[PDB]
Amino acid sequence: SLATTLERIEKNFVITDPRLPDNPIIFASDSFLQLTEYSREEILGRNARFLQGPETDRATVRKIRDAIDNQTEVTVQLINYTKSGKKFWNLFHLQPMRDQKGDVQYFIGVQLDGTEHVRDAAEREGVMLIKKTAENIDEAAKEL
Amino acid sequence: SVDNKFNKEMLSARVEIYGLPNLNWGQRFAFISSLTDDPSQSANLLAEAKKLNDAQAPK
Ligand SMILES: Cc1cc2nc3c(=O)[nH]c(=O)nc-3n(C[C@H](O)[C@H](O)[C@H](O)COP(=O)(O)O)c2cc1C
Ligand SMILES: [Cl-]
Ligand SMILES: [Cu+2]
């Protein structure tokens, strides 16, 4: 219901705090709630892995895990699930939010949902778009 | 608490703290994170954020 102005940006994203237990969600956009069918109250303080399910590729999930441990960006495509159990393909991009000194403070994660796995030009376009979305979220947060 | 409750008061505090204009982004995010970790302290955190906001008024 009550979203911060950052969470009203009309793209799917969450932001997590790696210094809280289990690197949990501290912001989630209204669009993300509509896509996934979760309420904000039931996902604040929770790690985003609940979006996965039985068909999610574990090698892809380990790639995300390895990037988070490296404190870097990553981009992958994986199967996710709404609260009611409906599958969707998620072209997903993670990137750290750093302070001026370069230290990681938070992670931004952006989701581009589709019914099908994307490849070739469609994949390139989608990767460009989610990267721009993450950059725009970072800029919106930091703006003076 | 063994179980954090995100009541109407806390959720409202997220919006109000985030909207304070004289905080920097690090402070806004730190307060939102603190609310997430201890939502029972919403009134106290909101009060502290508002104090900081007035202290950091542009001149
Ligand atoms: C900012 C952020 C956003 C994330 N968004 C998603 C997501 O949309 N879908 C997903 O399956 N995992 C997402 N994850 C990944 C999981 O939170 C977790 O990192 C992954 O499952 C690996 O850790 P685990 O093996 O402990 O589950 C996100 C992670 C972060 C930090
Ligand atoms: Cl994580
Ligand atoms: Cu592919």
Side-chain angles (χ1 to χ4, degrees), chain A residues 2-7 17 20 26-27 40-41 44-45 97-98 106 141-142, chain B residues 6 8 10-12 14-15 18-19 25-26 28-30 32-34 36-37:
Chain A
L2 311 98
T4 63
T5 57
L6 187 64
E7 290 166 309
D17 184 347
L20 289 177
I26 64 159
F27 290 99
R40 187 172 287 101
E41 33 266 81
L44 293 180
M97 282 190 81
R98 298 175 189 271
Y106 298 92
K142 292 185 181 186
Chain B
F6 307 117
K8 179 185 155 186
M10 177 264 187
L11 297 172
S12 167
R14 299 175 72 255
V15 182
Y18 196 84
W25 78 270
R28 289 187 187 108
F29 278 44
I32 289 299
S33 177
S34 289
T36 306
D37 201 48

Side-chain angles (χ1 to χ4, degrees), chain A residues 76-77 89 91 117-120 123:
Chain A
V76 298
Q77 275 195 81
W89 277 97
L91 182 55
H117 191 94
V118 300
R119 285 162 308 264
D120 298 324
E123 181 186 311

Side-chain angles (χ1 to χ4, degrees), chain A residues 45-63:
Chain A
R46 188 174 182 191
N47 181 289
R49 74 175 61 86
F50 59 82
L51 294 170
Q52 296 153 22
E55 293 183 38
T56 307
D57 186 314
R58 295 291 289 161
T60 309
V61 174
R62 176 170 62 190
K63 173 165 180 174

